Amino acid sequence: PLIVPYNLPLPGGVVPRMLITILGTVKPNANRIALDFQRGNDVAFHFNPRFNENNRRVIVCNTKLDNNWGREERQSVFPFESGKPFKIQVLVEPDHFKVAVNDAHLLQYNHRVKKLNEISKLGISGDIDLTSASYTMI
Ligand SMILES: [Cl-]
């Protein structure tokens, strides 16, 4: 197991065809999980499953620039379940990050930060037991 929060360096940033895979298990009675693809202090892509926002489960995505959050993109399709193992695959495409969970397509998030080769860290945090965080070129 890996210690959460975990920082996975992305050497030379991201590029299309780069696939990031995160394997873990959600804790029982989870409240939130976060993946933060960072460019320095900016967060190019924040992916945030929320297990209880006004008694609804929702995934909130956003970008943080100069410490300010932008417009949220919300997805009510919610594949995570407290206590169960999951696989999140984030595929960098030319115009967006494409996310699949447990081999099923979940959402796309168009690129707001354009300097992909400067998004060089992935922070993984929240209510999970983290098993593996890695990347490969497909
Ligand atoms: Cl940029």
Ligand 1 centroid from CA 69, angstroms: 15
Binding residues: 69-75
CATH number at 131 reads 2.60.120.200
* Three-state SS at 118: helix
Using the structure block, give the residue that is written with the tokens 């300097």: 115
Number of domains in the chain: 1
* Three-state SS at 81: coil
Nearest to 42 by CA among 3, 5, 2, 13: 13
Ligand 1 centroid from CA 27, angstroms: 35
* Three-state SS at 88: strand
Domain that holds residue 26: 1-138
Nearest to 4 by CA among 135, 138, 129, 137: 129
Instruction: Tell how far CA 47 is from the center of its chain.
Output: 4
- Torsion region of 112: left, alpha or beta (phi above 0 gives left; psi -120 to 50 gives alpha): alpha
Experimental method: X-ray
For residue 126, give both structure tokens. 């929240």
Vertex 30: Cα angle to 28 and 33 (nearest 5): 130
Report the alpha-carbon distance of residue 95 to residue 113 in Å, rounded: 11
Nearest to 19 by CA among 134, 113, 115, 131: 134
Residues that place a CB less than 5 A from ion ligand 1: 113-115
